[PDB]
Structures are given as structure tokens and as C-alpha cells.
């Protein structure tokens, strides 16, 4: 199954065609986790970020309710390898989730946390990018909305120290225009 | 620049390399090898053991005189090992 | 451009293929010899 | 100067790079360019001598490359004047870029 | 049991090391890593000589307040007694090495550094202690106590 | 140093004739005096440059007349006088017409030829003075080529075949430029230099040379002293030893300073090298000169002295032993007490001496030398290792030395310290090592040496493998393969194949090596053939241009062995298999192929050829167009063998 | 040395954990057959097994040199490139030959190519 | 950090026959104090000059910036002047007096 | 940024910190490090000369727009070959269409 | 005296990798091929020799 | 004579262990730790703990400036003079080796034609 | 002086590493610096040769009576590759006008 996916995806122009080629084959559904695990790995492992492999993962979600679930899971599966993956492929990912999350395939984030406690310098960069991409689409205002209604905590709190780590860290990223309220809270 | 040494002819046999192999020394010819070459160990010694009488490579054979130079008796003069008018090495 | 200008001989490659200097620091005292 | 002459000579060499047996005139061109590598200062002085003097050149061959729609003119010059002109061109563009002759709106530009 | 062995060892610098590594004599105050001339730093500022930053020197003989010359700092400089020192000074009180003026990068900024001249040096008639770079600002004055001369600094403007 | 201030007479010394000194002002001169102070002062002051846009004569000079082949941008300084076109109004016209030099230096080959003759026949006319005045600067030029140098050397020769009494004032003025030719990396440059100094010294007079070259003996720099010594060597070859003897014999006894005696002794040496075998008659007088330096208080003189004895004895190959006689007893004594280079030098001398002694006296004396020889294997000095190496050759290559003593005392340290990857990478150490090992084999026998060095055929580096390979080659060349046992022979053939299977460069050593090994083994090699020729075919493919030619040649040299043992299938193989490659487009391969066919023809006869000649020969016929050389060579050869 | 193949953690663990007789499949070549021929992969296999049979853990040192070297769940042996494979192969040949000559008191630079091939491949 | 062949003397050419030593001293006087300067007054050597400075690095900066530098319509030929060649027109002598002086004054 | 951090650290940059972007960018950043880079710094207007090569030379250049020496190589097709062989069934299946088993080569790993 | 320079500039390992000038790739001739930058396999890519034997390194590093 | 012969002999231990390369010995020591990894980690893959922290981070020593690259990458000692004294064979040897890599590629480019 | 020409025959011929003649030793740190200037001392040569490594202990030969250097030192580093680097690199060096020699 894993090999057939690759060949179907490498064959097809567009992102539309690979899904048609893939669905058409009517490969067994439960595997609908690992398949998608395949797509996330197959391009992300692939050398540079390309728009195609990210779109495919998402459509594959809208067509069946599970595919969406299959993805959100696979995003979780990252925690274990947030440190482990080498510092290129984070450049493919950060954006690559950026494009599922700008286009609504946000609150699944919340699971992600900012602490010197446990964050991988890997993970640090991962999330770093993720915002420096998703911003560049929503443009830091619609992002103001999405956050303000988000209730993302492990990211956004207690822990005045961790509010220095948070807010400071978003001065480092550079956006730091959604860190205001927290600045007030420091005070 | 290139001329004979003409030291006294000894009993040492002449030695020619690959290149010069067939040539009779003085007549420059390949015809009728008959008699044998003799040069002094002053000309042939050491690094010159089995050295070419001409170019300075290892001798693979022995030079034979023609019949032409035989009757004109030139083979009896001084040792015909060519010396360049610098040293011989 | 100024960054590529910050990033800013082959004849001296092919010309030096002709002849050579060949020599050490000991021999170059030759250059200090006046005529007679 | 050596820089420029080198560039131009490479450029000329690039047309023949595949190099089948070519022909006589082309042979003259390779041999003469090859000459220019060995004794560059000679070539440079000869060139500057032309540029200071000769006002009369030899006849240029012409032929048409066929694109099946619109034909493309193609010119052929004797090698000497090709090396001379080539160096003239690398030089002119170099000085030109240094002095900011061409304003930015002219864009078959090196940058992009 | 006074001196067990008459020689022992050193573990110390050699005169030929520090000698060969700095020679005009051997000098002190080797330029730090930062030092860069001021004109090229006005080239990275994109400044032609009109709007460029050039530090001109101004002389006043300490007894009589003007120009014996006027000096550019743009072309570090070794302030010393006169031959070794580039910025030679006729002052008889200056040690063979008096001081140095190095432009450094922190921006292209002027700096004055005393070499620990025996007398010292006064800045705005207020001395500075040896062995640290002290930034200078325009209109500041150089001559430790009352000094045959005075000096002033000017940026080129107006 | 060269920056020391100068004086107006010194100023008038440098520049040539016809120039004036100027003050423009006294004031601009005062600007030049303040300039030093103002090089600091006015550089710290206001300054800048700018340009304005305005519309716009251009003079210049190449060398025009008719042609005048081109001038490098520097050579102008020399040839500037030719550039000006003022013409047709005495000596100034001879210097002006002498620029035919320029035609010799740069231009087309014909211009160089015709120019060269024209200046040859004008020698007697122009005289040596103007020529050398206009040459020696060029041959002194810092930018001088290789070729240009050599050509100016040629013109100096050709003009010095004519001018005889004329050159007397210029002799030193010549040698100063020429002596650097004697010490050079190029060999042909050296034989040329020796030749032209020969022509100069013989051309000039003896007293001219002598009286000329004295002041260079005590010159501060040792360079001029050295190259000057080789100069005296050349002139002494010219005018003979006995004529120049009293000069030398006077020099080595000079009581002023040691440097002189050092020079003169070096002269004795370079005479030894140059004259070589021909030293023989005056050997006694020469020794009687040099002997007094061995005991001198200075060290150099002692060292270079004993070295010169070495060179003598080496050119003295055995004769004149008693002439060295009085020299010995001090030397042996010195052998005890010395540390460092001088010791090794003595070992060099004594080394070349021992073959010249009597096997009885040299028995004792030798047995004494062996001790120190042993002890001194271990020094890091490479000069040391060279000396003690060649020594071990001569001492232990003596007929009056016992095998077992060498086998025990010497061989284990010998292969320990001497066989290492420091040596083989060097050239001289490589060769000399080869020779010494060869001779040790010549005494102790074959199976020992080879048996110890076989395991190194499989060592990583090439040059090392090359070394042991050529060593095995020469050994089995002399002693013969009969001594070799069975197992060591398995390690042999496997070693030789293995080493042969990895070839970084193309060279004969591996090939001649293999061939000699096999032809020496005779038919003891027969069980090994199928492995050989299997390797021969598989390699006979590989990747083309590198190894095809080499495997082919391997067949060529292994032909007779593949014949006499009567393996006919193998001759079928090589016959038609090689027959098939005759369509190979790479010439350097095809040549080796035809060669292999040739060698196969000389073993199996005409009517038994597995590729019957009816097939073969017309298949050869079209190849004769093939241009590139080796093909034409081997091809025509084979067409010759079959056609005959 | 098909016996030493069960010294691998995965196989021995599987068998010791097995509660019923059952047939299981594996691919010992992993994905190798993509870049290489069958038989050559067979040589690499024999090298790996034998090497596991002699020094065991030290062969594991070769096969697990850098913690940045990983093995995928679908595969028995770590993922390596062809250069890496040639190197580790040389190292394994070194393990086998060195220990054989250490047992038999033979200088193993002196063995032949035929002998080495035999020793590695099987009984001589 | 210098090539050895360059020397304190520079041969300078492509000069006019009218040219003034005022322009000479002025222009060349940028790089350092002039040791002195000669100019060919003779039929062949007219148009050529030699410049000599108190220091070599002076001349180095000179040929650096003065390379192909312009005067009137002309681009001057600027080369580092050779050595030896024609020298012996003068002699080695007059060392005795000065050496006797340094042996007298300082006594060394 | 990598230049600025290197400046403040005074330590010059290595290969690895640039291994990320090595092949990326329209100038193809690696082209800074070309050995001959000097010479190319003095070449100007190359892009237009390529446009007018069609008149000087008979043959038709499709690549006229760029040049690998100034702009680098803007594509890497190395994958396309591997994926091609995969789609055809791998090496062996392809060889099953050939004479390879005729040549009696032990393996195809050494086909040259 | 340290040997100092303004800024840092760049290392060396890379600062001289790819050829120079060279120019694109022929006028644009068909005959050229040249599409691929590296060879297919590692057979000729991987090493000059697939096999060299020895225990030299072995019995040295062994101990 | 026990303590004295152990001054000379235990100095044979001291200068013997020192002779070779104290730097070299520690690297050898690390391998010994590796053997320990083998006993517990027979065939490690991925998430097992050493790999975990492993990818979870990605005695004076000389301070000033930078030390030019050394094939073997060794920082200079504490009090090192801070000046490059060399024949430059490292760079050129360093540069030349790099040049060859370019050569193998431009060698290939040849092959397709 | 002979060293540098051995490194040129080693680089020119494509020796390729481990067959290098620094593999001659593998057992030895201590290096030999001869032709050294007499004014030099411990701390100095330590400061210059700690460049390519960390030098553990050096014994410089200084004549026992007069107590001045005989002109050479045997040095010992902490690392061998420092020795390989030092012999292959620091050789043919100018110090105080005189070119030092190094070797294993
Ligand atoms: Zn003779
Ligand atoms: Zn010959
Ligand atoms: Zn004859």
C-alpha cells in the first residue's frame, strides 16, 4: 500500500488528480491513518516545501469525515518527534501545517505548549515557522481574531516567568502584536 | 656540441640501447654488421655500465661495425663513445 | 547587488603553464647580483 | 584587461564547444583564439591598435536560420575582427555598468 | 640550600615574538579586530564626500588659542614623539609612544586610547586612566596636566 | 638593507649615460623635503577627486618598422631605444642594429633562426663588448622565460665559438650570470652550463680564469663560493688537472681564513664528480692536498674534506688504494668520537673505501665498522639513512663477509627501520634502498629477502607496492627462482596478481615484474595459469582505456609460458578473443592487442594458428589508416612477421 | 550461518513470546533490491549473519555506529547508503578474518583471496 | 607583503618634450619625499624620466594609483626600474674616507 | 543574517550553516563560491549577449534566457530518473526485456 | 600582535568548490545530453575499487 | 628501594600513558562506553531513550578570535598565542581536496556525450 | 626542508590518507623541533604550538652548565592528530629569522 501511494502521487500533476487516482483504487479504509501518515511523511521527507503535498492531505479530509481526524491525530503524533526531526524538514512542516490551518482543516493547536520546561529547540523552530507562515496569509489581524476567540492556554496563560518566555519569544519570532494582552497581564 | 671522446680503445664491449640498436656508429648505417665495438672504461663506467653509446639509456645489445668502415680502418681510432661538449653526465 | 558585490588569474593560470619560477628562497639572491 | 579578454574568448569558444570537424574558416578561428590564450598582451595590443586605426573591414557572410515562421539573419565575420569586437563588447558593457549608464527601466537585465 | 639549581626555567614571552609580530622598533597597541577606515564605512552608508562623515582635526597651541595644519582622520593613527610614530608630535613631554587614536565598530565611531604615557593625557582638561578605549564625541578636546598644545575634533558638515 | 640612503656618486652609479638631475624650484624641492613630514601631515587633511561630464591626441608606440615582432610590456625598458623612429644620423648605430636580439628573443621560429646566423657572422664585427652589454641585462632579467634563457645561452655559445682573445675583460662578467646555471633543477640546463663554461675557460686563458675568479673564494655568501667551486671543476676539466694544481694546492694551505679552504676542498670534490674516472693519474697529489683538512680545528673543512675523499674513492673504483693510505688511520679514529653529520660523512668515505682494501686488512677494519653501522640504523636523519644504506651495500656486499652474521645481526633491524613509508615516497631513498636490498639478496640468498617482503605486496599504498615489486623483480632476475619453496610461491603468485589488479598509473614496473617472475618460475607456474588468465580476460574487459592495453601487454609477455606448458585451450581463448578486439576504436588499446597477437605468433606456428591466417591478415589490412602511432607500429610489425 | 540470524533481538524475542505454533514471514533484504541485485544482497546478508555469529555485539557496533543512524519498523537492519554499506562491509570482513586468524594463530594479511573468500563464505 | 622585483626607482615614459619639472614634483610628490628625479635631455631619451623616492612603499602606492595615469593627452608608462645592467661606468671607490670616519667618530 | 552573526562572532562561517540554502535562491547562492568568481564579477550584460547570439551563431538556443554561471542550475531532475525506474518495475523487470542474461554478466550493478 | 581584519568574511572548505566561468552549456546543441548531474548508481560512483583487502587497519586498531 | 623504583617505574606508567596521545586515549575510552550500550541496547531503533534525548537539544579553552579550520577540528589550547603560524599547507591541502570534488563532477558531465 | 617535498609527492600522486606516512607512527605524540632560536623558552614555544593542539609537556634541551638552549625541543601534546597536523603544517616556519624544523 505504501508503495502504491507514492507512485500514484508522483505520477499526478495537480493535487486533485492524486486523490482521484487514490480514491479510485479503493484501497482499504482503516489504513486511512497510515496512508495520510504516508502523505505527511512522503513530501515532508521530500526535500523542500511544495504546495502540492500539503493540499492533498487536506482534501483527503473533506471527502470523508475520518480523514480530517486521521490528520489531527498525525499532528499529535509529532510531539514525540518534535525534537527528533532534523532542522530542514521543520521548514517544510511549519508552513505545511500553516496551510491546513489557515484554510481551516485552529484550536487543535492548543495541545502545543510554550515552556522552557519542555519544548524541543526543534519544536521551538517548528512552531516558530508555523506562525511566520500562517501569519503571512491571514496577515496578523484575522490572526488577532482567531487567537482572541481561540482559548489557547498551554501557549497562553500563571507563570509570569513563562509570560516572559511567551511574550519575549514572540518578540523573537517578531510578530509580537498578538502578545499585547499578555504584556498587560505581566503588569 | 656533440663529438667523439677518442680516448684509447680498451677491451670493454660497446652497448647500444633500444633506439640506436641497429646502427653502425660512424657510417650511421644498418648494413653488414661484422666486427665489434670497443670503448674505454673511462667512457664506459658505473652508471655507464650497459649504457647507450649515444643517448644515455640502458644498452639492450652490442654495436656492430659495418664492412664499409672496416676496409677504411676507422674502427681502430679512439673510443667512439660520443661525448656532448658539456660533460658525459 | 551590493551583497553580490561583497562576494566580488585565469590568464595567470594558462600563462603560468608556460615556463615557471621553479626556485627557492635561497637561490633568489641571484637577483641581487650587479654586473661585474 | 586580462579578465575581459578571457571572458570574450571563452564566449567565442562556446559556439564551437560540441566541435565536430567543423571547417576551414572555423579552424582558423579556433587556432587564432587558442593563440590568444598563450600570448594575451600581444592580442590586447593588436586589438587596441585596430581600435585606434583601421576604418575598413572585410566582407561579412550572411545566411538565414529558418524558424519555419520568420527567418533570422545570421552574420559571419573573420576571426580577427571577432576577437577584437568581442573584447570591445565586454569592455563597453563593463564600463557602462560601472558608470550606471543605463537606467533601470531597460530590462534584458543581468540581475533578473 | 639557598639556590638549588642556578638556571631553572621561565615560561615567558620572547623578545623576538612580540618584536617580529609588531614592527614599524617594535610597537604597542596592535589594532583590535574591529578597526576599519572611516571612508569605506561612509561608503556602506552610501555617502559621497558631500554628505560623508570625515573627522577633521583642529590645532590650537596651548599657550595661544589656530591651525598649524588641519588633519583628517579618515585615511587608526599612532600619536607619538618625533622615526616610528605616524602622528608625530613636537611636544617634548610625549613618550616615544604617547597614545593612539583608533576608529572602531560598535557604527563607525572614533576612539582614543592612552598607551600609558608617563605624564598622561588630559581630555577636556580631565584625564582618563590607561588601557581602555574611550569613545570621543565631536568638539571634545585633547592635550595630563598643563601640555604645549591643544586639539579639537570636527565632523564635516555645513 | 636595500633601503639604506644613497649618495650622489652612488646615484650617478646606477643610471646609464645621458640623463640630467633637475630642481624645478627650490620651493618644490622644499615641498619634497616637507613631503615626508607631509606624507603624514597632508594625508591627514582635506582631499578628494571628481570628474565632470564634457565632450572631448592619443600618441603611443608599439615597435613599428616593417614588422618587429612584439614587445612584452616590461621588455620596453630594454628595447625602448628601438621604439623611437629617428633614423640614419657609429657605435650608437651598432647598438641600434643589435636589437636583432629582440628578433632572437621573441618572434617566429624563422626569425629566430635567420637572426641567430646573422648575429653569428657579425661577431668579429661588433665585438664582445657591445653584445654582452646588450645581452647580460636580458639574461639577467627577473621575468626571463625558460626558452628565452636557453636561447640566449645558445647565442652566447655560438658567439663564443669565434671570439677568443676578445672576451678576456668580460669573463667574470659572464660567469656571474652563468654560474647559476650549474645549480639548477633542470638537467639539460646543467649540461649546457658546463658546456659553455668549458668553451669560455678554454676560450680565454688559464691565467685569465685564475686571476679572474679569486675574489669569489672569500665572498661572504656561500652561494657564489659553491657555484664557483663547480666553475673551477668545469675549467679544470677544460685545461686539465696538472695545470691548475699549484693554484689549488696553494689554496687549501691558505692561512687567512677557513672559508677559502672550504671552497677549495669543495672544488676538489666537484672535480671528483665531474672528471670522475679520469682523476686517476693525479689522485696521489690530490690526496696529498686534501689530507691536511681532516685534522683542522674547524668542522666544515673536516666534513667536506672527508666527503671529497668519498667522491674520489667512488671515482677511484678499485685502484690507487695506497694513495688513500695515509688518510685512513685518522678517519677510523674519528669514527669513534663523532656525533652528527660529520660522522655520517666519514661513514660515506670509509664506505666507498672498503671495496678498495684487501680482504684481510678489510676483514678487521670491516668488522669494526659493522658495530657502529648497526647502532646507527635508527637515526631520524635522512642524510644518515642514505649514507648508512649505501654503506651496508658496500660493507655487506663484500665477498669477505659471512652470511649467517648478516642474517642474524643485520636483516631484522634492516627490514625494521629501513622498510617504512617514509622512505618509498622519496626518490633517491627508493632507488638506493632497492639496490641495497638487491645485494643483500645476492649474498644471503633469495627465499629470505623475498619471503620477508612478500606480505607487503598486499599493502595499501601504491609506491610501496611498486617498490617491493621491482625489488622482487630484480632479485628473481639475478638469483633465479629455483631457490623458492612452495608455499612462499603461492603467496608470490597471489601477491603479484593482487598487486597487479589495482593499478593507479600506467607503468612497466608491475608488468616487467610479473613477466620476469613467471619466466623465472618456469613450469613451476603451471598450476596457476587458470587463475592468471581468468583474471586476464575479466580485466581484459573492465573499463576500457586504462586497463585494456595493460592486460593485453600482460598476455604479450606471458605468451611463451602459456605455450611451452602445452595449454592449447588457452591459445584458442587468446587467439579468437584477441581476434575479436581488432575492432577496438581506442588506438592505445588496439596497439597492445596487436602486440599480444605478435607474441602469440612467435610461440604457436603458422599452420597451427587457431585464427587461421586467411581470417586474420585481411582483417588486419584496413587498419593501416589508423594514424595514431602504437597501432601503426605493432600492426606493421605483425604484417611483417606473417608476410615473412 | 542461518543459526545466528536468531540472535537478532526481534526474532528471538518474537519466538520466546510466541504462545502457539505459527508461520511468520520476513524480508531480510528490506528495500535493498531496489538499488542492488539479488545475489549481491545475498553476499551482504551472509556477511551480516556470520559477523553476528563471531563477535556479535561488536558487529552491532558496526551496524549501530551513530545514534543518528536509525532502522525503520518495516525493516530488519538499519537504513544506510551505498557508501555506508561498502564501509560497513569492509568492517565486517575485518571482524570475521581478524578473529579467525586470532584463533588459528595465522597472520591474516598473509591469507590469499581464495582463502579469505572461503573463510567468509563458509567452510574451507 | 611585497614582490621583490620592485625597487625604489621607477622608469616613467610617454612624457611630452615641453613638460615641466614643476608638474613632475607636484604630481609624483603625493606618495612620498623625492630622493631625486632624472629626465632624458638626449635625442633618444627625451620623453623619459626616472623617479627615486626615500622609500619603496612610496613607489608602491605610486605605481598602484599612478598606473596608466594621465597627463595632457597621454597615459604615462609607469614601470619599476631594473637594477645592475649598466653600472660600472662609475666605480666602487671612495669607501676609505667615510669608513675611516665612522671608525673615528663613533670609534667602532 | 548569517553574515551579520558571523561578524559579531568574529568566527567565519563554515559549510554547514549554509548547507540549508545551498542550492536555493534565484542567483543560486552557491554561485557566489564559484572558483572563477572573480572573472565573472567583471562580466556584464551577459544576458543580452545571449539574446543576440542567435544572430551571430546559426544554431537555435532554447536556454537563451539564463546562464548557469551567473544564475546557477535552476533545476535538479535527479529524482525523475529514480522515480522513472521505480514506475517501470525496478531494474530487474526492465532487464527482463533485454539481452542482459545473454552477456553472462554476474550482475547489472557494474553495467557501464 | 594578532592578525586581524574587519568583519570575519567566509571560511574555506567551500569557498572554492565549483568550476569557474565555464559558461552555460554550448549554444544549445541537441547532441549534448547532460541532463543529469550525477550518475545513476554507486557502482562507479562509490569507489575506485569496490574491493581492497587487508588486516593492516584491522590488526593495528585491534589491540 | 620500593618507593624509589616506584618513582621511576610509576613514572614509566605516567610518561608511558602520557607519551602516545592523552587526547587519543579518551576517544578510545568512549568506545568502551559504547560496548556498555550494546549489552542493554542489542539492536536499537528510533524512539528508544538514548535516541530520544539524543535528538532533544539540536578547564580553560582558548577564547579570542577564531582558530583556522584544522582537518581534525581541534580548538587550540588555553594560553595559545592567538596567531596563525603555518606553512598554509592545511588550507591548500584543504582547498585542493575540495577542488577534486568539483573535478569528479565535471569529469562526469563528460560521460554522457 | 626535505619534508615539504615529501608532502608534495604525497599530495601530487594522490596518496589518499591512511597510507600517509604519518601512519608510520600512531604510537607517538612527542615531536622534534630543531633549528630553534636560542632566545626562545618554554612558555613561548608552548604559546605558538598550542595552536594545533593542547601540549601536555615539553622538554627543551638546554645545556646543563650554561643553562641556555642547545637549540631544540622535544614536545608532547595531548592529541596525536595535533602531531600529524603540526609536522605536516607548522614546518618550514620562520622564527626570529631562522626556519625551524619539526618531525616525529
Ligand atoms: Zn674515453
Ligand atoms: Zn641510443
Ligand atoms: Zn660504419
Numbering used by the authors:
A (entry chain V): 455 to 559, 562 to 613, 619 to 648
B (entry chain 6): 7 to 95
C (entry chain 1): 82 to 89, 102 to 129
D (entry chain A): 835 to 946
E (entry chain X): 171 to 194, 209 to 249, 257 to 266, 280 to 286, 293 to 316, 323 to 359, 378 to 380, 384 to 395
F (entry chain 1): 394 to 449, 453 to 485, 490 to 1044
G (entry chain A): 1892 to 2015
H (entry chain 5): 12 to 119
Which text from the study accompanies this structure?
RNP remodeling of the B complex by the RNA-dependent ATPase/helicase Brr2 results in the dissociation of U1 and U4 snRNPs and the recruitment of about 20 protein components, forming the activated spliceosome (Bact complex). Conversion of the Bact complex into the catalytically activated B* complex by the ATPase/helicase Prp2 allows the branching reaction to occur, generating a 5′-exon and an intron lariat-3′-exon intermediate. In this manuscript, we report the cryo-EM structures of the human Bact complex in three distinct compositional and conformational states at resolutions of 4.9, 5.1, and 6.5 Å.
To gain insights into this dynamic process, we deleted the 3′-exon from the synthetic pre-mRNA with only 19 nucleotides downstream of the BPS such that Prp2 is unable to grab the RNA sequences for the Bact-to-B* conversion. Using a similar data processing strategy, 96 523 particles yielded a reconstruction of the early Bact complex at an average resolution of 4.9 Å. Second, the N-terminal domain (NTD) of the SF3a component SF3a66 (Prp11 in yeast) is present in the mature and late Bact complexes, but not in the early Bact complex. In addition, four proteins of the NTC (Prp19, Syf1, Spf27, and Cdc5), two components of the NTR (PPIL1 and Aquarius), and the PPI protein CypE are fully loaded in the mature and late Bact complexes, but not in the early Bact complex. Intriguingly, these two splicing factors are strongly present in the early Bact complex, suggesting a role of RNF113A in organizing the active site during spliceosome activation. The inability for Prp2 to bind and pull the 3′-end of the pre-mRNA likely allows the accumulation of this otherwise transient Bact species.
